């Protein structure tokens, strides 16, 4: 619950000749995945830093990768209009999903559901069936294209981190929220552990980092911001709650990993993560590890203490 | 139908190698037929900014990669500014060019040509930087050659036809000799097999066909002395009078 | 048979263009009085006539006075006389 | 904010005296001399005065005033004729003119609009042309500002209209007034960092001294945009305040550094020659050393780029960060492989500085194709500013100008979008568009673009937007005021034009707002150093290496600061600069002989460098392939000969 990274990372898979777009931790297995810009994804153990396997088949840069409840069926997406559903243990593509009109920015999956969210450069969010790959629903109403998507854990609302300076919330359009200057770059649904704690800081509750060097904690029911975390040097590329719920974990294009204790509007930790911009970020569900994938074409894992 | 001189050849090479699209200044109209023949196989069309169908011709030129000839460009529609700027956006397998009305797909290689008929045109500012000029001017050598060809064709059909056929033969001889040397490089890229020996004896036979050219240069030194000695003042007067 | 139009009125240039088309079709004489009063009409006339086939006996005449309201296109494209 | 002084109180009492009896009144003084501020300050003692600012251009017409009434007044038929009064009952509408003596004379020595205001004043009315009816004025009074006729752009006015309007000369504050007022400002601004309070005096004195030395040299005799009025001084101190607000701690040398940086961003931002830039920089350094006996380092640059706060920066990491942003910008927006160098950094920093400030409108002067539009679009993309531009084409008139402006103003104001306009020289031929931009630069609201059912649609959209924002308005008046505030805060329009002094003078005439409501940037042309950097950094891919190349005793140095033994690549790039340098001499000589020249811009240099690379590649490839063919042919010949 108090998992906050110490000075030096132990190991990192340096086997990339292209930048890293997303990094995510496997739920069950002690491994991590990383999508790169060379139309490839790499899967390897985080406890040793030895390459294990790779997913290939895309034609353009892979922008996102994730896991279901226990790894097993993976879902990746690449800017050549493509989404792909893979078997993790086999590291083989089993389904190819198409039907957009532009590149794809981000993807996610309900961990124990049967559908896929996809965020597309043509100003929309596509809902797909897992087994068929047929666009069961299409959500539109944006001015500029979408940067990220994330579903509610209860499968009722979808948060869309747009490029319209706004973050929207959509009924599976419930509302729109706007308290930023530049592009909003990432979102994350809050866990129950923060629910009481957030009441002390001042739902459902959302987090949103933006290109304006800010992070903001927002609420659906009121549409007004609760909290405004400031002090960022450059654009925020990641906003993740902590499992304990007291802490906010975020990364930005400034060579800094920031860990905030939102209870009293302080910056708990500022870690010199990389020598260039941090593109993506994730935390393991239970294990004391946090992964940062950076513009250095590297993916560094920090043990937590 | 390009002329035979340095200026038109410099323009012609300017009309095959380029980075910005070219702007040809044509006092005569020869460059029009030159571009008409150069890209004839591609179904190169021609239009003008004043033409009502300018935008449709433009759209076809980008979409199907077919080059296009644009004339009368003092009245320049600046809608073509993004094209000259090499500003495009690509989505997977679709490369599009913005055009104001909307962004539309274009082929990897299309060539748009801008042509002027009045050399005194002062182009608008957007053309002061977005293109490279090409002067189809005429100098003393071109006019002298034209006058000599005209006078020989008009007075002396035999001399004109003889010199034309002989120069064509000489060009053929030089081209065939260099081609036959290149083919000898290609083959050599003897004692192994008879097939290699067989084709080379025909080339030594065509080295003898160059004896045919060694003899034909003595016959055209005979056509070119008569006209040169008998037609100095005509050509000199023509060039001097026209430039004065 | 000579057609005689004057330059300066939009109605006048409309009829001048119509008469020029008719004369090119049927090979007649057409004469425009004091054409320097409209450089744009001069440009249109020159550039239209540069790319048309006229029937034999067609002749287009433009009378004008000495001034820099004439585009260089007509001064280079037309057979010129001074009076 | 108005700091009392002798001139302010005197003119403020006298303005009160005149406006009480509603007599017309014209303040004469050079632009930016506090005429508008003085009148607004005096007006607060009269709560019933509702002031609306008019915006005279050189193409002023009576309709400019007429439509203003149609927005701010209503006319009704009374038993003694027809009377026009402001809709705000019990309050007079004061039309505050800014440039009365600007509009050009007709061919026979008379401004039309001036006689129109004379008809207003003398006879207390005018003739409504819809039916030629004598409409009188109930609660209107006419005041204006002006510059002296001695200005080349301004004329003298006919005595017939000069007699109805008393005239007050509003001189500049002068040394003592500037000293007092900006000393008050500096003492106010040096308390966020208490340790700097004691340095309020030497700064302010320095602040004025350079300004004096900057105002008595760079006069309108040299250029038509040397407006060194003290209004910019207000930006200067504001800039320093904006550079010290978030810090709350700094040494004195940091203060001097931000002061010099604001001097460089308000001075040398408009100069034309390297000599004048040298003089201004030397004087900045000299006064800095005089009044105060990192900051001393010449490459002074500040940025809202690398860190959370506006802090001093070094060049190299700036370039690296710029390159990363270039990669992202290429990925997102457009595939345009630009070549960046030392001056591109300064230019993007300037454009960002303008986009940060409120009402950040700008004007760029440089050779066409020198990267003005692309750098503008780059900085607009970075800061989240959407970009709009004129889709200029054939058959494009005042109506379509007004329609496009209408739509984009609606987008920028209703939705709070931070749109930036790319205004270019390719649409300054329609006088109506020039006047419309003069208005929009003047006050951020054009009085007449939206009208009638269009105005109703505007007000519906404004009601929706204000409901979203959090300002409930139940009436169209305050709602339109909120729209004006949004347009004031949001837009950032930038103008581009070649360096043609006659063009600048014509633009100053047809739209003085282009030299009073927007900073002017002298892009000029790519200097020898920048062009050398472009060539050197773009020709890296070539194998331009000659180990045995020897440098002669005398070199034709076109780019200064070459290595004392210049390398092969160094000399080759020097020649690449020289080939473009020759064209300037060629055009100069040809024009000296009365010939027709054409522009020689950086895009020509880009084509030259790309062709140089392609040609070198092709020639090397052909020579190597021919050598290989010759060698293999000789090999087979020798093998069969020995066989
Ligand atoms: N008495 C004064 N002392 C110093 N600065 C002044 C004084 N009065 C006005 N200013 C400055 O002049 C600027 C406004 O100038 P003004 O003359 O109103 O512009 P305009 O050209 O529109 O008339 C303000 O920014 C203000 O700081
Ligand atoms: N500094 C530069 N380096 C490389 N290319 C440039 C530069 N400036 C302009 N360009 C080229 O010009 C095009 C756009 O030019 P533009 O921004 O309109 O120049 P300007 O605004 O100075 O006329 C782009 O396609 C770009 O490749």
Author numbering:
A (entry chain B): 92 to 263, 268 to 297, 308 to 410
B (entry chain A): 3566 to 3754, 3760 to 3814
C (entry chain A): 4065 to 4147
D (entry chain A): 2567 to 2859, 2865 to 3214
What text appears in the publication on this structure?
The lissencephaly 1 protein, LIS1, is mutated in type-1 lissencephaly and is a key regulator of cytoplasmic dynein-1. Recent work has shown that LIS1 has a conserved role in relieving dynein autoinhibition. At a functional level, Lis1 is a dimer of two β-propellers.
We revisited our cryo-EM datasets of human dynein and LIS1 and, with additional processing, solved the structures of human dynein bound to one and two LIS1 β-propellers to 4.0 Å and 4.1 Å, respectively. The closed state of the motor domain seen in our structures is the same as that observed in the autoinhibited Phi conformation of human dynein. We prepared our samples with ATP and vanadate included in the buffer. Based on map density, ADP is bound to AAA1 and AAA4, while AAA2 contains either ATP or ADP- Vi. Human LIS1 binds dynein in a manner similar to that of yeast dynein at sitering. There is a minor rotation in human LIS1ring relative to yeast Pac1ring that causes a slight shift in how LIS1 interacts with dynein. Additionally, the placement of LIS1 at sitering is the same whether one or two LIS1s are bound to human dynein.
